[PDB]
Amino acid sequence: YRAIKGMETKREIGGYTYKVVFYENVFQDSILLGNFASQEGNVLKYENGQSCWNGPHRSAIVTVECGVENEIVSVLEAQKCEYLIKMKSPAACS
Numbered sequence: 001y002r003a004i005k006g007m008e009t010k011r012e013i014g015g016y017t018y019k020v021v022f023y024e025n026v027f028q029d030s031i032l033l034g035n036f037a038s039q040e041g042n043v044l045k046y047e048n049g050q051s052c053w054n055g056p057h058r059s060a061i062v063t064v065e066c067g068v069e070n071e072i073v074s075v076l077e078a079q080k081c082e083y084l085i086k087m088k089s090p091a092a093c094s
């Protein structure tokens with residue numbers, strides 16, 4: 001997984017610097033969103049992030065689809081401290 005473990009993509013969204021590191025962790029500024037737990041298809045689950053006022057400990061579901069360059073396409077926090085992150089990356093290509 002070593003051709004992609006540790007690969008980092010960053011994007012500023014809404015003032016936050018989001019940082020996804022494949023098979024390691026996800027951060028929002030200095031806050032841990034989750035550590036890599038499992039993968040099903042293109043979907044990487046990151047779990048057990050930092051505690052959240054009036055919410056769950058943070059987690060992030062990162063969907064990585066084939067593209068020519070690493071990119072964080074969107075971050076959605078529909079439920080408090082549950083992050084849905086869509087990405088493109090050559091890691092997800094044939």
Ligand SMILES: OC[C@H]1O[C@H](O)[C@@H](O)[C@@H](O)[C@@H]1O
Pocket residue numbers: 028031052053077080081
């Ligand atoms: O107060 C909870 C709030 O804290 C920070 O803003 C960020 O981690 C947000 O994503 C989260 O919703």
